Ligand binder design. Structure first.
Ligand SMILES: CCCN(C[C@@H]1CCOC1)C(=O)c1cc(OC)c2oc(NCc3cccc(Cl)c3)nc2c1
Ligand SMILES: *[C@H]1O[C@H](CO)[C@@H](O)[C@H](O)[C@H]1NC(C)=O
Lengths: 27, 250, 11
């Protein structure tokens, strides 16, 4: 149920330093 | 990982180190997909041309790690293997087609800030994310250069490449069970997996549900980070019927 | 090698 939601990132609504690079590639 | 950067703490909590015994060394990467199952590349465990043939008792799984060489007391968890399952149609003779294996752990691992499973894609996930130009992320403790070793887990983001360009970069037969990724020479940017990273995860963050999915398994490259070459990845979704079948049976 | 010994409960 909780797969792919990282405790130190998604779970706390913090983003890592480069995830926005992947998002920007998803057109 | 060549031309990547140091992972942040907890950035890849599904990252698994396959650790060989006697002699104590990095065997491969892998990923955590539930509390009891780990995913990796078959050639990590079985590859006759290099006399590789590891059994359950030859290795350990180390989950929640960041430092490559340290024993990360109170953070990492070390698990023993109950059973290895290699895809029965893994093609080690020719092209590493269906380069995928599962490992069932003797005991479920406790999740923590540093230990957490990644999702596996369904057909819709693959159709929407597995597209040329879309980037995923590759992580591992493998070599920094083709010809040294990192202190901590390394991360690189790499674009998926069009299938004809993949095919035209190699003399190896590339199947529908593989995809390739990496920058083209004139894109300027660099980065690749390297020795020791095979078996690790290629992940993408779905912009629909904001979850991470393991789309690929680090399989093979002609050297590492060479101009006009790309890394080849096992296409996890295409192998998911096999994954489910194994987990459902065992 | 470069690896720190692990507690030999794992070994
Ligand atoms: C299918 C046989 C491939 N091969 C022969 C062809 C013929 C000319 O050379 C390529 C290999 O030499 C070979 C075999 C492997 O496993 C058996 C490898 O594993 C890795 N992993 C490290 C790596 C580095 C760059 C990107 C990723 Cl995605 C992973 N590279 C490997 C390379
Ligand atoms: C070890 O076991 C595997 C089982 O698939 C076999 O393919 C391999 O050749 C064996 N290796 C040796 C050295 O006996």
């Amino acid at each position: 149920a909780d797969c792919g939601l990282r405790p130190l990132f998604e779970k706390k609504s913090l983003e890592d330093k480069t995830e926005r690079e992947l998002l920007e590639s998803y057109i | 990982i060549v031309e990547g950067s140091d992972a942040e703490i907890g950035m890849s909590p599904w990252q698994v180190m396959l650790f060989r015994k006697s002699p104590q060394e990095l065997l491969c990467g892998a990923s955590l997909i539930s509390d009891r199952w780990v995913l990796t590349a078959a050639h990590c465990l079985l590859y006759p041309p290099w006399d590789k043939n590891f059994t359950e008792n030859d290795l350990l799984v180390r989950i929640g790690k960041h430092s490559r060489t340290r024993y990360e007391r109170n953070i990492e968890k070390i698990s023993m293997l109950e059973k290895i399952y290699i895809h029965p149609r893994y093609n080690w003779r020719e092209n590493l087609d269906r380069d995928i294996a599962l490992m069932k752990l003797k005991k479920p691992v406790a999740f923590s800030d540093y230990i957490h499973p990644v999702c596996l894609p369904d057909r819709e996930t693959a159709a929407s994310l597995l597209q040329a130009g879309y980037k995923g992320r590759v992580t591992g403790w493998g070599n920094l250069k083709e010809t040294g070793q990192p202190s901590v887990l390394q991360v690189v983001n790499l674009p998926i490449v069009e299938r004809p360009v993949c095919k035209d970069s190699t003399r190896i037969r590339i199947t529908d069970n593989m995809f390739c990724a990496g920058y083209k020479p004139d894109e300027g940017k660099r980065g690749d997996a390297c020795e020791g990273d095979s078996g690790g995860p290629f992940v993408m963050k779905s912009p629909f549900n904001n979850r991470w999915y393991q789309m690929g398994i680090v399989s093979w490259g002609e050297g590492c980070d060479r101009d006009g070459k790309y890394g080849f990845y096992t296409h996890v979704f295409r192998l998911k019927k096999w994954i489910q079948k194994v987990i459902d049976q065992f | 090698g470069d690896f720190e010994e692990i507690p030999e409960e794992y070994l």
